[PDB]
């Protein structure tokens, strides 16, 4: 039917960059 | 034996410099100074700094 160096620990950590990513206008 | 004593500054040499930045130890920070004198080699014949 169907188919199928490392030192400066405090100063070097205070100088870590804060890199904020840019935006694009829509 | 030290290798080339004309091109060498060894441990314990005293570099004399003058402090440029005023130092205040509240916050961790960077300093700067400038050498006041020529610094010869350990043989005393070549100005290396």
Identify whether the C-beta of residue B5 lies closer than 8 Å to the C-beta of residue B25: no
Distance from CA of B25 to the nearest CA of A (A): 12
Q: Which residues of A touch B30 (CB under 8 A)?
A: 11
The experimental technique used to determine this model is cryo-EM
The residues pairing with A10 across neighbouring beta strands, listed in sequence order, are: none
- Residue B13's alpha-carbon distances to B44, B45, B46, in angstroms, are 12, 15, 14
Q: Which of A7, A9, A11 would best serve as a mutation to test chain B binding (most B beta carbons within 10 A)?
A: A11
Indicate the burial class of B39 (C-beta count within 10 angstroms; 0-12, 13-18, 19 or more): middle
Calpha distance B49→B34 (Å, rounded): 11
Q: Which resolution in angstroms does this entry have?
A: 2.9
């Amino acid at each position: 039917l169907t188919a199928g160096g490392g030192g400066g620990g405090e100063l070097a950590e205070k100088l870590q960059p804060m890199r904020l990513s840019g935006s694009s206008a829509g | 034996r030290l290798g080339n004593r004309d091109m060498l500054i060894t441990q314990g040499t005293q570099l004399d410099c003058v402090l440029e930045t005023r130092l205040v130890t509240t916050q961790p920070g960077m300093t700067t100074c400038h050498l006041t004198r020529d610094v010869y080699s350990t043989s005393g014949r070549v100005v290396l700094l």
